[PDB]
mmCIF file of all heavy atoms in Angstrom:
data_model
loop_
_atom_site.group_PDB
_atom_site.id
_atom_site.type_symbol
_atom_site.label_atom_id
_atom_site.label_comp_id
_atom_site.label_asym_id
_atom_site.label_seq_id
_atom_site.Cartn_x
_atom_site.Cartn_y
_atom_site.Cartn_z
ATOM 1 N N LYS Y 1 -127.674 25.977 214.124
ATOM 2 C CA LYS Y 1 -128.810 26.504 213.374
ATOM 3 C C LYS Y 1 -128.344 27.440 212.262
ATOM 4 O O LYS Y 1 -129.131 27.823 211.397
ATOM 5 C CB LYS Y 1 -129.766 27.252 214.303
ATOM 6 C CG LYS Y 1 -129.098 28.533 214.804
ATOM 7 C CD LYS Y 1 -129.999 29.205 215.841
ATOM 8 C CE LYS Y 1 -131.240 29.775 215.151
ATOM 9 N NZ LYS Y 1 -132.081 30.486 216.155
ATOM 10 N N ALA Y 2 -127.065 27.818 212.295
ATOM 11 C CA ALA Y 2 -126.514 28.721 211.291
ATOM 12 C C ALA Y 2 -126.730 28.160 209.890
ATOM 13 O O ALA Y 2 -126.795 28.908 208.916
ATOM 14 C CB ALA Y 2 -125.018 28.909 211.541
ATOM 15 N N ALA Y 3 -126.846 26.840 209.793
ATOM 16 C CA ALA Y 3 -127.060 26.197 208.501
ATOM 17 C C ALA Y 3 -128.360 26.695 207.866
ATOM 18 O O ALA Y 3 -128.429 26.923 206.652
ATOM 19 C CB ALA Y 3 -127.131 24.679 208.685
ATOM 20 N N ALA Y 4 -129.386 26.868 208.693
ATOM 21 C CA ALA Y 4 -130.673 27.347 208.203
ATOM 22 C C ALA Y 4 -130.563 28.800 207.757
ATOM 23 O O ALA Y 4 -129.968 29.627 208.446
ATOM 24 C CB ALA Y 4 -131.731 27.225 209.302
ATOM 25 N N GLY Y 5 -131.135 29.099 206.599
ATOM 26 C CA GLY Y 5 -131.091 30.452 206.065
ATOM 27 C C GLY Y 5 -129.855 30.654 205.188
ATOM 28 O O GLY Y 5 -129.742 31.660 204.489
ATOM 29 N N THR Y 6 -128.935 29.691 205.226
ATOM 30 C CA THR Y 6 -127.723 29.778 204.431
ATOM 31 C C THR Y 6 -127.807 28.845 203.230
ATOM 32 O O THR Y 6 -127.403 29.200 202.123
ATOM 33 C CB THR Y 6 -126.515 29.411 205.286
ATOM 34 O OG1 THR Y 6 -126.078 30.558 206.002
ATOM 35 C CG2 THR Y 6 -125.397 28.897 204.387
ATOM 36 N N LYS Y 7 -128.340 27.655 203.458
ATOM 37 C CA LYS Y 7 -128.478 26.678 202.386
ATOM 38 C C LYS Y 7 -129.428 27.184 201.301
ATOM 39 O O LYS Y 7 -129.390 26.714 200.164
ATOM 40 C CB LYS Y 7 -129.018 25.369 202.945
ATOM 41 C CG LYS Y 7 -127.960 24.711 203.838
ATOM 42 C CD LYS Y 7 -128.502 23.396 204.405
ATOM 43 C CE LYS Y 7 -127.437 22.746 205.290
ATOM 44 N NZ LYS Y 7 -127.965 21.470 205.850
ATOM 45 N N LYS Y 8 -130.284 28.136 201.658
ATOM 46 C CA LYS Y 8 -131.246 28.687 200.709
ATOM 47 C C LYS Y 8 -130.517 29.346 199.539
ATOM 48 O O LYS Y 8 -131.072 29.488 198.450
ATOM 49 C CB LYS Y 8 -132.104 29.731 201.415
ATOM 50 C CG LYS Y 8 -132.874 29.066 202.550
ATOM 51 C CD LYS Y 8 -133.611 30.134 203.353
ATOM 52 C CE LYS Y 8 -134.177 29.496 204.614
ATOM 53 N NZ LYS Y 8 -134.884 30.529 205.430
ATOM 54 N N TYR Y 9 -129.272 29.753 199.777
ATOM 55 C CA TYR Y 9 -128.484 30.404 198.736
ATOM 56 C C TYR Y 9 -128.288 29.461 197.556
ATOM 57 O O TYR Y 9 -127.984 28.282 197.728
ATOM 58 C CB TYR Y 9 -127.116 30.819 199.293
ATOM 59 C CG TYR Y 9 -127.303 31.711 200.501
ATOM 60 C CD1 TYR Y 9 -126.309 31.763 201.486
ATOM 61 C CD2 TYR Y 9 -128.470 32.475 200.645
ATOM 62 C CE1 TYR Y 9 -126.483 32.576 202.612
ATOM 63 C CE2 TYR Y 9 -128.641 33.286 201.769
ATOM 64 C CZ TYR Y 9 -127.649 33.338 202.753
ATOM 65 O OH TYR Y 9 -127.822 34.140 203.864
ATOM 66 N N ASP Y 10 -128.469 30.001 196.358
ATOM 67 C CA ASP Y 10 -128.320 29.209 195.140
ATOM 68 C C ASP Y 10 -126.918 29.372 194.570
ATOM 69 O O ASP Y 10 -126.590 30.403 193.982
ATOM 70 C CB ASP Y 10 -129.351 29.647 194.096
ATOM 71 C CG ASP Y 10 -130.748 29.214 194.526
ATOM 72 O OD1 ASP Y 10 -130.842 28.389 195.419
ATOM 73 O OD2 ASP Y 10 -131.705 29.714 193.956
ATOM 74 N N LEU Y 11 -126.095 28.346 194.750
ATOM 75 C CA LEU Y 11 -124.724 28.380 194.256
ATOM 76 C C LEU Y 11 -124.493 27.269 193.232
ATOM 77 O O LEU Y 11 -123.476 27.255 192.541
ATOM 78 C CB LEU Y 11 -123.749 28.204 195.415
ATOM 79 C CG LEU Y 11 -124.165 29.111 196.574
ATOM 80 C CD1 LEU Y 11 -123.213 28.916 197.751
ATOM 81 C CD2 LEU Y 11 -124.130 30.574 196.128
ATOM 82 N N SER Y 12 -125.445 26.342 193.135
ATOM 83 C CA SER Y 12 -125.331 25.237 192.192
ATOM 84 C C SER Y 12 -125.307 25.765 190.761
ATOM 85 O O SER Y 12 -124.893 25.066 189.836
ATOM 86 C CB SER Y 12 -126.510 24.280 192.367
ATOM 87 O OG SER Y 12 -127.706 24.934 191.968
ATOM 88 N N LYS Y 13 -125.749 27.005 190.587
ATOM 89 C CA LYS Y 13 -125.761 27.614 189.262
ATOM 90 C C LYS Y 13 -124.458 28.368 188.999
ATOM 91 O O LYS Y 13 -124.219 28.836 187.883
ATOM 92 C CB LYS Y 13 -126.943 28.576 189.139
ATOM 93 C CG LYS Y 13 -128.249 27.793 189.276
ATOM 94 C CD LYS Y 13 -129.435 28.719 189.009
ATOM 95 C CE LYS Y 13 -129.569 29.724 190.156
ATOM 96 N NZ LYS Y 13 -130.797 30.543 189.953
ATOM 97 N N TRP Y 14 -123.618 28.488 190.026
ATOM 98 C CA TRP Y 14 -122.352 29.190 189.889
ATOM 99 C C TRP Y 14 -121.271 28.247 189.389
ATOM 100 O O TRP Y 14 -121.113 27.139 189.897
ATOM 101 C CB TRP Y 14 -121.929 29.776 191.239
ATOM 102 C CG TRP Y 14 -122.770 30.967 191.555
ATOM 103 C CD1 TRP Y 14 -124.112 31.025 191.415
ATOM 104 C CD2 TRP Y 14 -122.355 32.271 192.064
ATOM 105 N NE1 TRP Y 14 -124.547 32.274 191.796
ATOM 106 C CE2 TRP Y 14 -123.507 33.079 192.208
ATOM 107 C CE3 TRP Y 14 -121.107 32.824 192.412
ATOM 108 C CZ2 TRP Y 14 -123.426 34.389 192.678
ATOM 109 C CZ3 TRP Y 14 -121.025 34.144 192.887
ATOM 110 C CH2 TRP Y 14 -122.182 34.924 193.019
ATOM 111 N N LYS Y 15 -120.522 28.704 188.402
ATOM 112 C CA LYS Y 15 -119.445 27.897 187.839
ATOM 113 C C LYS Y 15 -118.380 27.612 188.886
ATOM 114 O O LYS Y 15 -118.281 28.308 189.897
ATOM 115 C CB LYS Y 15 -118.801 28.621 186.657
ATOM 116 C CG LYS Y 15 -119.808 28.785 185.521
ATOM 117 C CD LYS Y 15 -120.101 27.422 184.888
ATOM 118 C CE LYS Y 15 -121.006 27.601 183.666
ATOM 119 N NZ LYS Y 15 -121.268 26.270 183.043
ATOM 120 N N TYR Y 16 -117.580 26.583 188.631
ATOM 121 C CA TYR Y 16 -116.517 26.211 189.548
ATOM 122 C C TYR Y 16 -115.586 27.388 189.766
ATOM 123 O O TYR Y 16 -115.234 27.713 190.900
ATOM 124 C CB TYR Y 16 -115.728 25.022 188.991
ATOM 125 C CG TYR Y 16 -114.478 24.813 189.814
ATOM 126 C CD1 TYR Y 16 -114.564 24.267 191.100
ATOM 127 C CD2 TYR Y 16 -113.231 25.168 189.287
ATOM 128 C CE1 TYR Y 16 -113.402 24.081 191.860
ATOM 129 C CE2 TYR Y 16 -112.071 24.982 190.046
ATOM 130 C CZ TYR Y 16 -112.157 24.438 191.331
ATOM 131 O OH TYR Y 16 -111.011 24.260 192.078
ATOM 132 N N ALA Y 17 -115.188 28.027 188.674
ATOM 133 C CA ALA Y 17 -114.295 29.174 188.770
ATOM 134 C C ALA Y 17 -114.957 30.309 189.548
ATOM 135 O O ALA Y 17 -114.308 30.994 190.341
ATOM 136 C CB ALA Y 17 -113.906 29.659 187.374
ATOM 137 N N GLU Y 18 -116.249 30.500 189.307
ATOM 138 C CA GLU Y 18 -116.997 31.554 189.979
ATOM 139 C C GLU Y 18 -117.042 31.311 191.482
ATOM 140 O O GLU Y 18 -116.848 32.235 192.268
ATOM 141 C CB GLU Y 18 -118.428 31.617 189.432
ATOM 142 C CG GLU Y 18 -118.409 32.156 187.999
ATOM 143 C CD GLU Y 18 -119.812 32.103 187.402
ATOM 144 O OE1 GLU Y 18 -120.669 31.482 188.009
ATOM 145 O OE2 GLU Y 18 -120.007 32.682 186.348
ATOM 146 N N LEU Y 19 -117.282 30.066 191.879
ATOM 147 C CA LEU Y 19 -117.330 29.734 193.294
ATOM 148 C C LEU Y 19 -115.970 29.938 193.935
ATOM 149 O O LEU Y 19 -115.873 30.426 195.060
ATOM 150 C CB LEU Y 19 -117.778 28.281 193.474
ATOM 151 C CG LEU Y 19 -119.262 28.166 193.139
ATOM 152 C CD1 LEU Y 19 -119.645 26.689 193.007
ATOM 153 C CD2 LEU Y 19 -120.087 28.794 194.266
ATOM 154 N N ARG Y 20 -114.920 29.566 193.218
ATOM 155 C CA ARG Y 20 -113.577 29.720 193.739
ATOM 156 C C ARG Y 20 -113.292 31.186 194.033
ATOM 157 O O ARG Y 20 -112.800 31.534 195.109
ATOM 158 C CB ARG Y 20 -112.575 29.194 192.713
ATOM 159 C CG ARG Y 20 -111.170 29.220 193.317
ATOM 160 C CD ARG Y 20 -110.142 28.898 192.234
ATOM 161 N NE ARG Y 20 -110.041 30.000 191.285
ATOM 162 C CZ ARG Y 20 -109.335 29.888 190.157
ATOM 163 N NH1 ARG Y 20 -108.709 28.775 189.863
ATOM 164 N NH2 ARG Y 20 -109.267 30.900 189.337
ATOM 165 N N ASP Y 21 -113.624 32.043 193.075
ATOM 166 C CA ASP Y 21 -113.419 33.474 193.241
ATOM 167 C C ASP Y 21 -114.333 34.015 194.333
ATOM 168 O O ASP Y 21 -113.930 34.865 195.125
ATOM 169 C CB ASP Y 21 -113.688 34.210 191.926
ATOM 170 C CG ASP Y 21 -113.261 35.671 192.043
ATOM 171 O OD1 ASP Y 21 -112.975 36.099 193.149
ATOM 172 O OD2 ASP Y 21 -113.224 36.342 191.024
ATOM 173 N N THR Y 22 -115.572 33.522 194.368
ATOM 174 C CA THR Y 22 -116.523 33.980 195.364
ATOM 175 C C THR Y 22 -116.016 33.687 196.767
ATOM 176 O O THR Y 22 -116.093 34.533 197.649
ATOM 177 C CB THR Y 22 -117.861 33.284 195.151
ATOM 178 O OG1 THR Y 22 -118.343 33.598 193.856
ATOM 179 C CG2 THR Y 22 -118.859 33.763 196.203
ATOM 180 N N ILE Y 23 -115.504 32.481 196.975
ATOM 181 C CA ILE Y 23 -114.991 32.098 198.286
ATOM 182 C C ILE Y 23 -113.820 32.988 198.694
ATOM 183 O O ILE Y 23 -113.766 33.481 199.821
ATOM 184 C CB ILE Y 23 -114.535 30.640 198.253
ATOM 185 C CG1 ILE Y 23 -115.755 29.739 198.085
ATOM 186 C CG2 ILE Y 23 -113.826 30.299 199.563
ATOM 187 C CD1 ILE Y 23 -115.300 28.313 197.766
ATOM 188 N N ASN Y 24 -112.884 33.189 197.771
ATOM 189 C CA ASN Y 24 -111.714 34.021 198.047
ATOM 190 C C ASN Y 24 -112.126 35.455 198.360
ATOM 191 O O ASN Y 24 -111.540 36.103 199.227
ATOM 192 C CB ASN Y 24 -110.773 34.003 196.845
ATOM 193 C CG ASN Y 24 -109.918 32.742 196.881
ATOM 194 O OD1 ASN Y 24 -108.741 32.799 197.234
ATOM 195 N ND2 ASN Y 24 -110.456 31.589 196.581
ATOM 196 N N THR Y 25 -113.135 35.943 197.650
ATOM 197 C CA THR Y 25 -113.617 37.301 197.865
ATOM 198 C C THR Y 25 -114.730 37.331 198.910
ATOM 199 O O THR Y 25 -115.249 38.398 199.238
ATOM 200 C CB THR Y 25 -114.131 37.880 196.547
ATOM 201 O OG1 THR Y 25 -115.188 37.068 196.055
ATOM 202 C CG2 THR Y 25 -112.993 37.914 195.532
ATOM 203 N N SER Y 26 -115.110 36.163 199.421
ATOM 204 C CA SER Y 26 -116.171 36.091 200.406
ATOM 205 C C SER Y 26 -115.746 36.764 201.701
ATOM 206 O O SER Y 26 -114.701 36.445 202.269
ATOM 207 C CB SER Y 26 -116.510 34.629 200.684
ATOM 208 O OG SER Y 26 -117.525 34.568 201.671
ATOM 209 N N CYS Y 27 -116.573 37.685 202.165
ATOM 210 C CA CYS Y 27 -116.297 38.396 203.404
ATOM 211 C C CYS Y 27 -117.318 38.029 204.483
ATOM 212 O O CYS Y 27 -117.286 38.577 205.584
ATOM 213 C CB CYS Y 27 -116.328 39.905 203.157
ATOM 214 S SG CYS Y 27 -115.023 40.347 201.982
ATOM 215 N N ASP Y 28 -118.227 37.104 204.164
ATOM 216 C CA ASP Y 28 -119.246 36.687 205.119
ATOM 217 C C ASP Y 28 -119.117 35.195 205.420
ATOM 218 O O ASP Y 28 -118.924 34.387 204.514
ATOM 219 C CB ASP Y 28 -120.634 36.975 204.541
ATOM 220 C CG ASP Y 28 -120.891 38.479 204.520
ATOM 221 O OD1 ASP Y 28 -120.135 39.199 205.149
ATOM 222 O OD2 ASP Y 28 -121.843 38.888 203.874
ATOM 223 N N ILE Y 29 -119.234 34.833 206.692
ATOM 224 C CA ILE Y 29 -119.142 33.443 207.093
ATOM 225 C C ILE Y 29 -120.286 32.621 206.506
ATOM 226 O O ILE Y 29 -120.108 31.459 206.135
ATOM 227 C CB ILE Y 29 -119.174 33.364 208.615
ATOM 228 C CG1 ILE Y 29 -119.051 31.909 209.028
ATOM 229 C CG2 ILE Y 29 -120.493 33.940 209.139
ATOM 230 C CD1 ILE Y 29 -118.825 31.811 210.537
ATOM 231 N N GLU Y 30 -121.460 33.233 206.423
ATOM 232 C CA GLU Y 30 -122.633 32.554 205.883
ATOM 233 C C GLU Y 30 -122.397 32.164 204.426
ATOM 234 O O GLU Y 30 -122.711 31.050 204.011
ATOM 235 C CB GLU Y 30 -123.856 33.476 205.975
ATOM 236 C CG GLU Y 30 -124.279 33.634 207.438
ATOM 237 C CD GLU Y 30 -125.373 34.691 207.557
ATOM 238 O OE1 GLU Y 30 -125.620 35.372 206.574
ATOM 239 O OE2 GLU Y 30 -125.944 34.809 208.627
ATOM 240 N N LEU Y 31 -121.829 33.084 203.659
ATOM 241 C CA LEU Y 31 -121.547 32.815 202.259
ATOM 242 C C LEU Y 31 -120.499 31.716 202.132
ATOM 243 O O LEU Y 31 -120.583 30.858 201.252
ATOM 244 C CB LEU Y 31 -121.057 34.086 201.570
ATOM 245 C CG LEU Y 31 -120.891 33.815 200.080
ATOM 246 C CD1 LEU Y 31 -121.336 35.043 199.283
ATOM 247 C CD2 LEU Y 31 -119.422 33.525 199.784
ATOM 248 N N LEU Y 32 -119.507 31.754 203.014
ATOM 249 C CA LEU Y 32 -118.437 30.765 202.996
ATOM 250 C C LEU Y 32 -119.016 29.374 203.211
ATOM 251 O O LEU Y 32 -118.650 28.421 202.522
ATOM 252 C CB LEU Y 32 -117.430 31.081 204.111
ATOM 253 C CG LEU Y 32 -116.663 32.357 203.759
ATOM 254 C CD1 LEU Y 32 -115.923 32.869 204.996
ATOM 255 C CD2 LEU Y 32 -115.652 32.055 202.653
ATOM 256 N N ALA Y 33 -119.939 29.278 204.154
ATOM 257 C CA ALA Y 33 -120.592 28.013 204.442
ATOM 258 C C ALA Y 33 -121.412 27.554 203.241
ATOM 259 O O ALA Y 33 -121.480 26.362 202.941
ATOM 260 C CB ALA Y 33 -121.498 28.153 205.672
ATOM 261 N N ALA Y 34 -122.042 28.508 202.565
ATOM 262 C CA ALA Y 34 -122.867 28.195 201.409
ATOM 263 C C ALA Y 34 -122.031 27.565 200.302
ATOM 264 O O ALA Y 34 -122.439 26.584 199.681
ATOM 265 C CB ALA Y 34 -123.533 29.477 200.893
ATOM 266 N N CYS Y 35 -120.858 28.133 200.069
ATOM 267 C CA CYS Y 35 -119.971 27.618 199.038
ATOM 268 C C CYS Y 35 -119.480 26.231 199.415
ATOM 269 O O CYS Y 35 -119.387 25.342 198.571
ATOM 270 C CB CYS Y 35 -118.789 28.566 198.863
ATOM 271 S SG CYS Y 35 -119.429 30.094 198.159
ATOM 272 N N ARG Y 36 -119.174 26.058 200.695
ATOM 273 C CA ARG Y 36 -118.701 24.775 201.187
ATOM 274 C C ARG Y 36 -119.761 23.707 200.977
ATOM 275 O O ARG Y 36 -119.457 22.584 200.575
ATOM 276 C CB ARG Y 36 -118.366 24.894 202.673
ATOM 277 C CG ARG Y 36 -117.081 25.707 202.841
ATOM 278 C CD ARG Y 36 -116.874 26.011 204.325
ATOM 279 N NE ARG Y 36 -115.621 26.729 204.530
ATOM 280 C CZ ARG Y 36 -115.309 27.274 205.710
ATOM 281 N NH1 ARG Y 36 -116.126 27.178 206.731
ATOM 282 N NH2 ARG Y 36 -114.178 27.912 205.850
ATOM 283 N N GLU Y 37 -121.008 24.070 201.234
ATOM 284 C CA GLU Y 37 -122.115 23.143 201.052
ATOM 285 C C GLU Y 37 -122.257 22.760 199.584
ATOM 286 O O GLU Y 37 -122.485 21.594 199.261
ATOM 287 C CB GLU Y 37 -123.413 23.785 201.523
ATOM 288 C CG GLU Y 37 -123.399 23.903 203.045
ATOM 289 C CD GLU Y 37 -124.561 24.777 203.511
ATOM 290 O OE1 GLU Y 37 -125.088 25.512 202.691
ATOM 291 O OE2 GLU Y 37 -124.904 24.701 204.679
ATOM 292 N N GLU Y 38 -122.122 23.746 198.695
ATOM 293 C CA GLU Y 38 -122.241 23.479 197.272
ATOM 294 C C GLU Y 38 -121.130 22.544 196.815
ATOM 295 O O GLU Y 38 -121.357 21.639 196.015
ATOM 296 C CB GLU Y 38 -122.178 24.790 196.486
ATOM 297 C CG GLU Y 38 -122.308 24.499 194.991
ATOM 298 C CD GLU Y 38 -123.636 23.805 194.708
ATOM 299 O OE1 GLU Y 38 -124.578 24.045 195.447
ATOM 300 O OE2 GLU Y 38 -123.688 23.031 193.767
ATOM 301 N N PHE Y 39 -119.932 22.772 197.329
ATOM 302 C CA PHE Y 39 -118.791 21.946 196.963
ATOM 303 C C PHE Y 39 -119.005 20.502 197.406
ATOM 304 O O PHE Y 39 -118.736 19.572 196.653
ATOM 305 C CB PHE Y 39 -117.517 22.495 197.610
ATOM 306 C CG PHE Y 39 -116.917 23.582 196.738
ATOM 307 C CD1 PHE Y 39 -117.743 24.395 195.948
ATOM 308 C CD2 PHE Y 39 -115.529 23.771 196.716
ATOM 309 C CE1 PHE Y 39 -117.181 25.393 195.138
ATOM 310 C CE2 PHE Y 39 -114.968 24.769 195.907
ATOM 311 C CZ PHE Y 39 -115.793 25.579 195.118
ATOM 312 N N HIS Y 40 -119.491 20.319 198.626
ATOM 313 C CA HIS Y 40 -119.735 18.985 199.145
ATOM 314 C C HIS Y 40 -120.782 18.266 198.300
ATOM 315 O O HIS Y 40 -120.600 17.110 197.917
ATOM 316 C CB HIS Y 40 -120.218 19.084 200.592
ATOM 317 C CG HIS Y 40 -120.241 17.716 201.196
ATOM 318 N ND1 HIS Y 40 -120.899 17.431 202.383
ATOM 319 C CD2 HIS Y 40 -119.672 16.543 200.786
ATOM 320 C CE1 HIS Y 40 -120.709 16.124 202.643
ATOM 321 N NE2 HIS Y 40 -119.967 15.534 201.700
ATOM 322 N N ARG Y 41 -121.880 18.959 198.008
ATOM 323 C CA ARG Y 41 -122.951 18.371 197.210
ATOM 324 C C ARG Y 41 -122.459 18.048 195.805
ATOM 325 O O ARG Y 41 -122.755 16.983 195.261
ATOM 326 C CB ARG Y 41 -124.128 19.346 197.127
ATOM 327 C CG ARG Y 41 -124.756 19.534 198.511
ATOM 328 C CD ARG Y 41 -125.474 18.248 198.924
ATOM 329 N NE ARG Y 41 -126.263 18.467 200.129
ATOM 330 C CZ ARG Y 41 -126.951 17.477 200.698
ATOM 331 N NH1 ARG Y 41 -126.936 16.269 200.189
ATOM 332 N NH2 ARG Y 41 -127.651 17.711 201.773
ATOM 333 N N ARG Y 42 -121.694 18.966 195.226
ATOM 334 C CA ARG Y 42 -121.157 18.757 193.892
ATOM 335 C C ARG Y 42 -120.202 17.574 193.878
ATOM 336 O O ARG Y 42 -120.237 16.746 192.966
ATOM 337 C CB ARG Y 42 -120.443 20.020 193.410
ATOM 338 C CG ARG Y 42 -121.481 21.055 192.974
ATOM 339 C CD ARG Y 42 -120.763 22.219 192.295
ATOM 340 N NE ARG Y 42 -121.722 23.118 191.667
ATOM 341 C CZ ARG Y 42 -121.342 24.000 190.742
ATOM 342 N NH1 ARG Y 42 -120.089 24.094 190.370
ATOM 343 N NH2 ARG Y 42 -122.236 24.770 190.194
ATOM 344 N N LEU Y 43 -119.360 17.484 194.899
ATOM 345 C CA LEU Y 43 -118.414 16.381 194.994
ATOM 346 C C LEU Y 43 -119.147 15.051 195.142
ATOM 347 O O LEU Y 43 -118.749 14.047 194.552
ATOM 348 C CB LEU Y 43 -117.483 16.596 196.186
ATOM 349 C CG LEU Y 43 -116.515 17.738 195.878
ATOM 350 C CD1 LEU Y 43 -115.803 18.164 197.163
ATOM 351 C CD2 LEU Y 43 -115.478 17.255 194.863
ATOM 352 N N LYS Y 44 -120.214 15.047 195.934
ATOM 353 C CA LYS Y 44 -120.980 13.833 196.151
ATOM 354 C C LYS Y 44 -121.565 13.326 194.838
ATOM 355 O O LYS Y 44 -121.496 12.135 194.533
ATOM 356 C CB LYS Y 44 -122.114 14.117 197.134
ATOM 357 C CG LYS Y 44 -122.895 12.833 197.421
ATOM 358 C CD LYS Y 44 -121.996 11.845 198.170
ATOM 359 C CE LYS Y 44 -122.815 10.631 198.582
ATOM 360 N NZ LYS Y 44 -121.939 9.664 199.305
ATOM 361 N N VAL Y 45 -122.139 14.239 194.065
ATOM 362 C CA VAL Y 45 -122.734 13.876 192.787
ATOM 363 C C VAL Y 45 -121.664 13.336 191.849
ATOM 364 O O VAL Y 45 -121.886 12.369 191.121
ATOM 365 C CB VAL Y 45 -123.411 15.094 192.158
ATOM 366 C CG1 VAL Y 45 -123.846 14.753 190.732
ATOM 367 C CG2 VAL Y 45 -124.637 15.481 192.988
#
C-alpha cells in the first residue's frame, strides 16, 4: 500500500538531471519510490 500516497507526487515535471540529483539527495523512501515510478513511466513512453 506504500505505493498509495506516493504516486501523487509530481515528478514528470522534473528534468532528468533534477531527478538524478533528487534521488541522490533523497533521504525518504517514499520520494525514492516516486522517482523510480517516474523513471519507469518515462522509460515506457
Side-chain angles (χ1 to χ4, degrees):
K1 68 186 290 183
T6 275
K7 291 180 180 180
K8 298 174 190 179
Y9 304 153
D10 289 345
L11 314 179
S12 67
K13 297 186 290 185
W14 286 45
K15 296 290 185 179
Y16 169 73
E18 290 175 349
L19 288 167
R20 186 188 70 189
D21 189 349
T22 300
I23 292 169
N24 279 256
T25 60
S26 179
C27 297
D28 289 347
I29 181 170
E30 289 172 350
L31 185 142
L32 290 166
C35 292
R36 288 171 177 170
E37 289 169 341
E38 180 60 29
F39 275 31
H40 190 194
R41 294 290 189 182
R42 283 189 170 197
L43 288 167
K44 182 66 174 180
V45 172

